Design a protein around this ligand. Structure first.
Ligand SMILES: OC[C@H]1O[C@@H](O[C@@H]2[C@@H](O)[C@H](O[C@@H]3[C@@H](O)[C@H](O)O[C@H](CO)[C@H]3O)O[C@H](CO)[C@H]2O)[C@H](O)[C@@H](O)[C@@H]1O
Ligand SMILES: OC[C@H]1O[C@@H](O[C@@H]2[C@@H](O)[C@H](O)O[C@H](CO)[C@H]2O)[C@H](O)[C@@H](O)[C@@H]1O
Ligand SMILES: [Cl-]
Length: 247
């Protein structure tokens, strides 16, 4: 029971309960925000919502309301900043903000989702720098990885590399897929049993729990970089070839 729906803001036309068949492989949903998932039903299809303060403060996710939203919605887990390593946030800045605003939530917490960049001061390098800046004063349960690349072998080596750099830590993968042009179905088919087998991986969320039509209209940048082959829904709102693996 490690799988989750990476559920975008534009997903009002779709029903998260489509990818929940009661077998209990799919357990979680997050929407990059602290507001409840926008859905066709207005519910989360029996999945546990994970609030996310994905920027330091926004109109959609006001950090002044993070603690009140958490208490009001009953989250068991919270995610923090989305890809600060490429969004202009220094490790020291992230550590200070995380201690002020995320530390106080007395639930399960993940450090910010970092990219798979190999550039010094991005990706896992940035993450190490933030753990240094934290100076033992950050409270967290999880490190949170994104990965986009061209093969299962590369993905497997990256997760192994993160584990070798952070051997004590538990990992959440809040976004992952191949870049455009690969065989997304074969990748996820290999990745799900690999991740299900790792004791130090708690949750994974394929990019992305939407349809090709919604991804094209609302996130043309993701279509450029990933394509529409990892969408868990068809335009008809049913499970795609990738969605079918989630069950
Ligand atoms: O109508 C659905 C929902 O819309 C919310 O406002 C949204 C923002 O949440 C959205 O924010 C995007 C992030 O979720 C994503 O990670 O990054 C992108 C790109 O930077 C953001 O745009 O932006 C849209 C587009 O303007 C807004 O309409 C409301 O806050 C919410 O109450 C409402 O249910
Ligand atoms: O994220 C690690 C653990 O955080 C816990 O809450 C912390 C409190 O126990 C501690 O006393 O204070 C800090 C600062 O507010 C809290 O973050 C959670 O209760 C645990 O579930 C979590 O594993
Ligand atoms: Cl990563």
């Amino acid at each position: 029971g490690k799988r989750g729906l990476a559920w975008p803001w534009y997903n009002s036309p779709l029903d998260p309960g489509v990818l929940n068949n009661g077998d209990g492989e799919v357990v979680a949903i997050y929407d990059w925000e602290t507001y409840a998932p926008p859905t066709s039903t207005g519910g989360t299809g029996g999945l546990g919502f994970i609030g996310m303060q994905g920027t330091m403060d926004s109109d959609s996710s006001p950090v002044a309301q993070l603690a009140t939203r958490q208490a009001q919605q009953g989250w068991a887990t919270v995610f923090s900043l989305n890809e600060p390593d490429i969004n202009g946030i220094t490790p020291a800045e992230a550590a200070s903000w995380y201690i002020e605003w995320v530390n106080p939530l007395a639930i399960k917490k993940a450090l910010p989702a970092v990219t798979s960049s190999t550039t010094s001061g991005q990706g896992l390098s940035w993450l190490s720098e933030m753990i240094s800046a934290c100076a033992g004063a950050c409270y967290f349960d999880y490190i949170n990885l994104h990965w986009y690349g061209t093969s299962f072998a590369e993905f497997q080596a990256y997760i192994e590399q993160a584990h070798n750099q952070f051997p004590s830590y538990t990992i959440v993968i809040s976004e992952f897929a191949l870049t455009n042009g690969g065989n997304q179905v074969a990748f996820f088919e290999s990745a799900f049993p690999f991740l299900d087998g790792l004791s130090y991986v708690l949750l994974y969320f394929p990019f992305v729990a939407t349809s090709p039509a919604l991804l094209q209209a609302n996130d043309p940048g993701a279509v450029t970089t990933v394509g529409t082959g990892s969408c868990l829904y068809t335009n008809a709102g049913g499970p795609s070839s990738v969605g079918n693996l989630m069950y």
